[PDB]
Design a protein around this motif. Structure first.
Motif, mmCIF file in Angstrom:
data_model
loop_
_atom_site.group_PDB
_atom_site.id
_atom_site.type_symbol
_atom_site.label_atom_id
_atom_site.label_comp_id
_atom_site.label_asym_id
_atom_site.label_seq_id
_atom_site.Cartn_x
_atom_site.Cartn_y
_atom_site.Cartn_z
ATOM 1 N N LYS B 137 1.765 0.636 14.690
ATOM 2 C CA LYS B 137 1.477 1.024 13.293
ATOM 3 C C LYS B 137 0.533 0.026 12.639
ATOM 4 O O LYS B 137 0.743 -1.184 12.799
ATOM 5 C CB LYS B 137 2.768 0.978 12.505
ATOM 6 N N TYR B 139 -1.392 -0.779 8.887
ATOM 7 C CA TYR B 139 -1.642 -0.583 7.461
ATOM 8 C C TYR B 139 -3.007 -1.186 7.176
ATOM 9 O O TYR B 139 -3.228 -2.410 7.334
ATOM 10 C CB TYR B 139 -0.590 -1.269 6.614
ATOM 11 N N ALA B 164 -1.233 8.671 7.017
ATOM 12 C CA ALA B 164 -1.076 8.517 5.547
ATOM 13 C C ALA B 164 -2.355 8.051 4.917
ATOM 14 O O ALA B 164 -3.076 7.238 5.513
ATOM 15 C CB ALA B 164 -0.034 7.549 5.270
ATOM 16 N N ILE B 165 -2.642 8.547 3.702
ATOM 17 C CA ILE B 165 -3.832 8.143 2.939
ATOM 18 C C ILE B 165 -3.426 8.172 1.467
ATOM 19 O O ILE B 165 -2.930 9.178 0.972
ATOM 20 C CB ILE B 165 -5.055 9.084 3.148
ATOM 21 N N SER B 166 -3.532 7.023 0.813
ATOM 22 C CA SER B 166 -3.306 6.855 -0.578
ATOM 23 C C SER B 166 -4.391 7.586 -1.428
ATOM 24 O O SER B 166 -5.398 8.069 -0.881
ATOM 25 C CB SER B 166 -3.353 5.332 -0.902
ATOM 26 N N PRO B 167 -4.168 7.695 -2.752
ATOM 27 C CA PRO B 167 -5.304 8.047 -3.621
ATOM 28 C C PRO B 167 -6.386 7.005 -3.487
ATOM 29 O O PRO B 167 -6.120 5.868 -3.062
ATOM 30 C CB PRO B 167 -4.711 7.992 -5.042
ATOM 31 N N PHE B 178 -5.876 3.009 0.849
ATOM 32 C CA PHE B 178 -4.929 2.525 1.835
ATOM 33 C C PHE B 178 -4.594 3.635 2.809
ATOM 34 O O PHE B 178 -4.358 4.767 2.413
ATOM 35 C CB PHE B 178 -3.650 2.050 1.174
ATOM 36 N N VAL B 179 -4.591 3.319 4.080
ATOM 37 C CA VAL B 179 -4.219 4.293 5.086
ATOM 38 C C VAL B 179 -3.219 3.689 6.078
ATOM 39 O O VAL B 179 -3.107 2.470 6.173
ATOM 40 C CB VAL B 179 -5.403 4.867 5.867
ATOM 41 N N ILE B 180 -2.552 4.570 6.825
ATOM 42 C CA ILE B 180 -1.638 4.175 7.874
ATOM 43 C C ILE B 180 -2.095 4.829 9.115
ATOM 44 O O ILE B 180 -2.357 6.040 9.116
ATOM 45 C CB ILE B 180 -0.170 4.542 7.581
ATOM 46 N N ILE B 213 1.416 11.812 4.804
ATOM 47 C CA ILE B 213 1.422 11.406 3.402
ATOM 48 C C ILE B 213 0.009 11.657 2.886
ATOM 49 O O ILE B 213 -0.949 11.022 3.349
ATOM 50 C CB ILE B 213 1.867 9.984 3.222
ATOM 51 N N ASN B 215 -2.079 11.784 -0.084
ATOM 52 C CA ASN B 215 -2.270 11.415 -1.465
ATOM 53 C C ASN B 215 -3.726 11.340 -1.931
ATOM 54 O O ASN B 215 -3.987 11.255 -3.141
ATOM 55 C CB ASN B 215 -1.511 10.142 -1.776
#
Ligand SMILES: NC(=O)c1ccc[n+]([C@@H]2O[C@H](COP(=O)([O-])OP(=O)(O)OC[C@H]3O[C@@H](n4cnc5c(N)ncnc54)[C@H](OP(=O)(O)O)[C@@H]3O)[C@@H](O)[C@H]2O)c1
Ligand SMILES: NC(=O)c1ccc[n+]([C@@H]2O[C@H](COP(=O)([O-])OP(=O)(O)OC[C@H]3O[C@@H](n4cnc5c(N)ncnc54)[C@H](OP(=O)(O)O)[C@@H]3O)[C@@H](O)[C@H]2O)c1
Ligand SMILES: Cc1nc(=O)c2cc(CN(C)c3ccc(C(=O)N[C@@H](CCC(=O)O)C(=O)O)s3)ccc2[nH]1
Ligand SMILES: Cc1nc(=O)c2cc(CN(C)c3ccc(C(=O)N[C@@H](CCC(=O)O)C(=O)O)s3)ccc2[nH]1
Ligand SMILES: Cc1nc(=O)c2cc(CN(C)c3ccc(C(=O)N[C@@H](CCC(=O)O)C(=O)O)s3)ccc2[nH]1
Ligand SMILES: Cc1nc(=O)c2cc(CN(C)c3ccc(C(=O)N[C@@H](CCC(=O)O)C(=O)O)s3)ccc2[nH]1
Ligand SMILES: O=c1ccn([C@H]2C[C@H](O)[C@@H](COP(=O)(O)O)O2)c(=O)[nH]1
Ligand SMILES: O=c1ccn([C@H]2C[C@H](O)[C@@H](COP(=O)(O)O)O2)c(=O)[nH]1
Ligand SMILES: [Cl-]
Ligand SMILES: [Cl-]
Lengths: 503, 501
Positions: B137, B139, B164-167, B178-180, B213, B215
């Motif tokens: 994983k 971040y 995952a991707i933040s706004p 931010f991504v995962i 996620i 976003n």
């Protein structure tokens, strides 16, 4: 204890408004196939993990002898379930287990008859015993919004239960109904919080509608959630009226008009006034006396001398509201004189044009009626709150979207949702179309400060199933609808909530 | 050699050119937000774990040079066990020191109670962790700009995917998110209480299905494309190319954080800006756009289209009383695109901008292009019909009603266009930026765009760009294309999409 080991029984039942469940050993209402599919799905589900370990496992359904006799013989025993009948007079029934009482049966079943889950399917003898003795922890209940003649009744559910789930409202041509779950009163992964990019510990909202309802599929929750959201996060702002309001911008609600009629159930809403107002719009009227004469006073204060004089309309007759909604719908572009003038053949009859275009060119993407006539705004007592609306046809169903620039969530909005729902049903009927969705866009959505207590009361109330709308099917032109042709059936509501208008 | 040394979690922040360091420092100006992300991500202990052992901490591991790059006053990093790898330093105050990674991970897991192990660089460590498969994983903070540097984050192997991707966020100097990354290798009552079929075939189209996620605001648009392809009705329309259609959506974009110019294809920004400037000046002359190499309205002003739709006495590219005319001259008598309309009709744009200044709590801040009286004279009635402003907390928002939404071609322009307009109005009114709320009525995908949009919805969005307007501009009519700058635009390739007339 006599009932040691006999708890956590799950009830399914369908109940009329007067608590009736049976009549002459039959179901008291016409057959609702949907409800039977719901019972069957509910009572035959086995969790995937359980079914893989014991692939032949089944749930148990228990009923009284009379209820067994009330089921069509060809459907017995109920398929894919262990059927258990309680009786002190019959010893044996084909394909079923028979016991003399409930406690014996549950104990015998749980010790000696491998199964998944036990369901209680009535009748009142059984329901009463199960409820009177604390044996049931969950109730799947179909609520019917109508009283039926009957002789068999569902017992009162104790106040130890609460509603935790409500389905969307459904309807047949004879009743409106929904599905609920009652249960006894007695977190998200960290990455979800991190990947918002904002504070990982957020103060939870100050107001939450019906906080005990976890599955919130009734369409009325859209409205209640909006009320709670504005109270929780809206900005207090001054406005034209002189009473401040909590405000937030941009929402979109939708209502499936094929299933129910979205007249709010969390307060008693004055339907008659909604219908009279709509008919007044449709006939093109700008004369507020036409509504007063019908004991509808919703537009009275905006046509009064002191409001008119206050807003520069010193030469306007009382209740001459100017070129408002109905004038724009039927006469867009005509020169407004007064509410007494003849406008036959003047301006553009948008309502007539759009209804004709729905018939002749349903795939057109300009099916719009616009009341925001920039040239006339200055002449109106109040500019239109519901500004613009657009129709849409697909798969022989009519939908409508409406833009509301300014949304008084306490007072106006409930009327506005019902109003456009009726209009959409009227247009669908005269165009021979089925019903799609009413999509309601809210721009400036707000709660006046003097309505906060009322709204706080309202958002805690559990919605009843919505009612249903029946229009007289003989009416073929939109101008011919009268109030007797527009009937809302099966309206169950909480009490009316007084809410004062600012202005 | 690395037995028992897996499931290490990387945190890192990476510029567009893969640079992570320069002169043993961070290459970009300080982003305090990014450090909160790091601190929050690396100090988290699950509540079940924390109550069973209340003093438990995570481990952070870094190379010696990374440790020396952190201000002394912050070291050791608080609330974490700090581990430095070095073959030249044996002791560091407050920290554990090892000579190599395998030794350290084994020692920690066997002998140093802790919760989770994090890898905080530098490239010597990230390169070892990734080369040997020790990470499950990542971040990662994505920065949309290149920075000078001498230390680089290694390529992430194709065994990882973004989940995952933040706004999208922004400072004055960069946009970022931010991504995962992770390795590729519903209770029944919820189904029952819909009241509809409990067995529900999955939709045929799903945008970026590996991203759980979701976003980034661009997922609103991609989700709509997938929804219309999955559930839209194929029906005819005016153009004679059929379209899949569905009714009623609402998107919103936080204009304070980013500029919503789609990243899943390269969008022609120059044309969006020139079109907007043309609207603002009230022009109905399509030649004014052609002269600027912008041809988006060209087919709708051609003789062949004009003459087929009954405009036989109109000059070519006289589009009639369309958007700009209505914005600046609602109610004026249209003659032709060569006439003087100075002081004629109602200047809605000017009136509403003044009212935002004088009475921002007014609830009629509307510009309406649906002039029922003029529709018959327009080469095409307006797609974006009506828009409404709103002011709260010293921020301007805008909602726009789009009656008809070509999701492949027009809609990406329409989103960016009203975003710019809202930023422009906010600036001239001295306000901050709120939200652009986009209402879609008839939303559709023409049949000849299905292949293109299928390609597009599989592309992982980049962080959105940011908009910077020239701060000296005081009046909306004074904006020129040089005053409207989009920075840090990273996109996937352009996708050709032909217009149905
Ligand atoms: N809407 C719904 O959801 C629903 C659900 C169920 C039933 N129903 C309706 O309800 C009616 C049938 O219910 P019901 O209440 O009349 O009868 P019931 O409870 O189904 O049957 C009563 C019989 O069951 C035996 N029994 C079981 N427990 C008993 C007890 N605690 N005390 C005495 N006898 C007990 C007795 O049979 P012996 O006389 O052999 O001892 C008794 O006569 C029908 O009209 C049916 O259509 C409606
Ligand atoms: N943007 C970001 O997220 C980010 C994150 C981290 C760092 N950075 C930047 O990256 C730069 C520092 O990274 P770097 O790659 O130059 O250096 P580094 O990896 O932090 O440190 C290299 C040194 O650490 C020791 N080391 C590393 N791995 C080792 C191993 N497996 N076994 C034994 N010793 C090991 C060695 O020290 P000895 O020579 O003493 O043996 C080596 O010389 C700085 O500019 C910093 O600001 C940026
Ligand atoms: C939610 C609910 N609705 C009901 O109508 C209901 C009825 C019973 C009474 N009883 C337990 C019944 C079971 C089945 C019956 C019936 O008349 N069935 C039809 C349809 C078959 C099916 O799909 O279930 C038939 O056999 O023709 S009547 C018990 C729980 C309930 N629960
Ligand atoms: C501030 C303000 N809010 C409004 O909602 C509003 C509505 C109208 C006209 N409008 C369209 C109305 C819809 C519903 C109304 C109302 O007073 N409802 C009361 C009583 C209804 C009755 O008894 O007829 C209520 O719902 O309690 S008034 C005029 C001025 C307004 N002014
Ligand atoms: C997502 C991410 N962003 C980063 O900038 C980053 C930097 C490192 C390098 N290293 C592991 C660092 C840890 C802490 C540092 C730092 O410079 N801290 C400042 C800022 C304090 C604050 O704003 O909270 C300091 O201590 O003053 S530098 C490792 C992983 C990362 N991960
Ligand atoms: C069926 C139809 N769909 C539309 O979206 C549409 C749009 C306009 C005008 N409009 C407002 C436009 C916005 C974007 C456009 C376009 O062709 N974009 C291409 C090429 C852009 C360029 O390089 O200039 C694209 O995005 O690929 S066209 C006129 C007729 C239409 N007709
Ligand atoms: O059908 C209507 C008519 C009016 N309003 C509300 C919105 C405002 O609270 C008020 C009108 O005031 P202005 O927005 O025009 O200030 O009435 C409604 O909600 N629905
Ligand atoms: O700014 C614009 C202009 C047009 N359209 C699209 C919607 C339709 O696909 C087409 C217009 O055709 P009608 O809706 O008017 O038939 O162009 C847009 O999406 N955005
Ligand atoms: Cl109807
Ligand atoms: Cl003409």
């Amino acid at each position: 204890n006599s009932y040691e080991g006999c708890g956590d029984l799950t009830i399914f039942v369908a109940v009329a408004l007067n608590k009736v469940i049976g009549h002459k050993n039959q179901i008291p209402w016409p057959h609702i196939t949907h409800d039977f599919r719901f019972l069957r799905n509910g009572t035959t589900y086995i969790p995937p993990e359980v079914l893989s370990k014991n692939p032949d496992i089944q749930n148990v359904v228990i009923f009284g002898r009379k209820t067994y006799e009330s089921i069509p013989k060809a459907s017995l025993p109920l398929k894919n379930r262990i059927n258990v009948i309680l009786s002190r007079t019959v010893k044996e029934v084909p394909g079923c287990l028979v016991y003399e009482d409930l406690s014996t049966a549950i104990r015998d079943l749980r010790a000696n008859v491998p199964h998944n889950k036990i369901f209680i399917l009535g009748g009142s003898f059984l329901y009463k015993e199960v409820l009177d003795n604390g044996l049931c922890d969950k109730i799947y209940l179909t609520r019917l919004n109508k009283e039926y003649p009957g002789d068999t009744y569902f017992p009162d559910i104790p106040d130890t239960f609460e509603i935790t789930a409500i389905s969307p409202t459904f309807s047949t041509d004879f009743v409106s109904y929904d599905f609920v779950i009652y249960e006894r009163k007695d977190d998200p992964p960290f990455d979800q919080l991190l990947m918002t990019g904002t504070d990982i510990s957020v103060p939870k909202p100050k107001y939450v509608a019906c906080p005990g309802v976890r599955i919130r599929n009734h369409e009325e929750f859209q409205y209640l959630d909006i009320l709670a959201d504005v109270l929780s996060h809206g900005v207090l702002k001054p406005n034209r009226t002189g009473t401040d309001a909590y405000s937030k911008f941009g929402y979109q609600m939708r209502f499936d008009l094929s299933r129910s009629f979205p007249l709010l159930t969390t307060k008693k809403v004055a339907l008659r006034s909604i219908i009279e107002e709509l008919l007044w719009f449709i006939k093109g009227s700008t004369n507020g006396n036409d509504l007063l004469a019908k004991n509808v006073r919703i537009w009275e204060l905006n046509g009064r001398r002191d409001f008119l004089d206050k807003n520069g309309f010193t030469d306007r007759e009382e209740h001459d509201l100017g070129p408002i909604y109905g004038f724009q719908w039927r006469h867009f572009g005509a020169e407004y004189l007064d509410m007494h003038a003849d406008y036959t053949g003047k301006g553009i009859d948008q309502l007539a044009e759009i209804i004709n275009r729905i018939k002749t060119n349903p795939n057109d993407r300009r099916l719009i009626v616009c009341s925001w006539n920039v040239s006339d705004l200055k002449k109106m007592a109040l500019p239109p709150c519901h500004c613009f609306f657009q129709f849409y046809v697909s798969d022989n169903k009519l939908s409508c979207m409406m833009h509301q620039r300014s949304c008084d969530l306490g007072l106006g909005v409930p009327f506005n949702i019902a109003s456009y729902s009726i209009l959409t049903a009227m247009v669908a009927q005269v165009c021979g179309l089925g019903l799609g969705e009413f999509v309601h866009n809210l721009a400036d959505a707000h709660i006046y400060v003097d309505h906060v207590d009322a709204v706080t009361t309202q958002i805690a109330r559990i919605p009843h199933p919505f009612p249903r709308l029946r229009l007289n099917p003989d009416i073929r032109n939109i101008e011919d609808f009268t109030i007797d042709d527009i009937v809302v059936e099966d309206y169950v509501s909480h009490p009316p909530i007084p809410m004062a208008m600012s202005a």
